[PDB]
Design a protein around this ligand. Sequence first.
Ligand SMILES: COc1cc(-c2cncc(-c3ccc(C4CCN(C)CC4)cc3)c2C)cc(OC)c1OC
Ligand SMILES: COc1cc(-c2cncc(-c3ccc(C4CCN(C)CC4)cc3)c2C)cc(OC)c1OC
Ligand SMILES: COc1cc(-c2cncc(-c3ccc(C4CCN(C)CC4)cc3)c2C)cc(OC)c1OC
Ligand SMILES: O=C(O)[C@H]1CCSC1
Ligand SMILES: O=C(O)[C@H]1CCSC1
Length: 285
Amino acid sequence: RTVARDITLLECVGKGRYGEVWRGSWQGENVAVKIFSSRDEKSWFRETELYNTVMLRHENILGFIASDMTSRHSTQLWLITHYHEMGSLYDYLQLTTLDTVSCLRIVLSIASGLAHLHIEIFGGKPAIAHRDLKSKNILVKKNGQCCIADLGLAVMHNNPRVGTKRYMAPEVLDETIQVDCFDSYKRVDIWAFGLVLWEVARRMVSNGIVEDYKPPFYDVVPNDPSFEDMRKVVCVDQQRPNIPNRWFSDPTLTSLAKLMKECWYQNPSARLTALRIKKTLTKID
Ligand SMILES: COc1cc(-c2cncc(-c3ccc(C4CCN(C)CC4)cc3)c2C)cc(OC)c1OC
Ligand SMILES: COc1cc(-c2cncc(-c3ccc(C4CCN(C)CC4)cc3)c2C)cc(OC)c1OC
Ligand SMILES: COc1cc(-c2cncc(-c3ccc(C4CCN(C)CC4)cc3)c2C)cc(OC)c1OC
Ligand SMILES: O=C(O)[C@H]1CCSC1
Ligand SMILES: O=C(O)[C@H]1CCSC1
């Protein structure tokens, strides 16, 4: 039989230190093709090893299609996934505001994806921690739900080696994280989840008011904040993202402020679990 492997790369939709992401076409169908830099080859190996161990399939996890290694004169490393034309949550929040139903649908879908990663199923799948959760690593689907992307730093029950500094938990910044305990990595994801919840909630309209899109800690650290910049804010001063007064006039944003506080405790073991966040979100509105 013919094995059709040609992908037409149509347009570059992302460029960074990691390499590039392209919208591509395979057999009439849109795919996303991540082309890894030599700098970030370990992310391709980790994601590939994870998918070789467990073929994750979940509506709120970016859908795997293929991992390709091709010999050149160098080695070319591609990861091929489903394509989400609306782009990342980061991209989407810049222009778009949200109503109550759209805000809740986004954050419950992220909680659903994250709980699916975290849970060991004994049938099944090992427990997985993401280790780089942020709004750029979440894609928006046409049905209003999101999916979690980029398992290049994921751990299974370290890696390329640290996550995005702006989203690092206090125990990562102060180097107290108990690195031999798998639950430690789940708790780091919950911290980052809380920051994403804050980024989304700001864009939910209430009483004719909305906040502009800002990244977590926009008001206390520079662009491309250093490790030290983040440690001083999060660990030494114990600062947390601001909850605007206008949220306390809206029952949904009041409930979301309480949830994000319960993701941001200095004590990692005090933070809510992804399953408890899902349950809380299903009872809001
Ligand atoms: C190698 O490389 C790539 C391959 C493909 C691809 C193209 N056509 C058909 C296939 C296919 C799938 C599954 C079977 C089964 C049939 C039942 N039998 C009992 C076991 C085997 C055969 C063939 C594939 C996997 C796409 C790619 O990109 C999207 C590839 O990557 C470049
Ligand atoms: C990698 O990705 C894609 C692959 C394909 C594709 C192409 N040829 C054959 C297959 C296939 C056929 C049959 C089996 C099974 C059937 C039951 N039992 C006998 C074991 C073997 C598996 C695989 C597929 C899945 C299509 C896709 O999209 C339409 C893909 O997505 C881009
Ligand atoms: C995060 O991680 C990965 C993401 C993807 C991915 C999948 N669907 C769609 C996208 C996308 C499409 C389009 C835009 C637009 C936004 C508006 N404007 C700025 C021009 C461009 C942004 C994003 C991406 C980037 C694939 C991946 O691997 C193949 C990823 O890595 C695992
Ligand atoms: O790039 C790396 O360091 C990884 C390759 C496979 S295992 C370690
Ligand atoms: O086990 C889980 O939590 C996943 C099943 C479908 S939704 C999440």
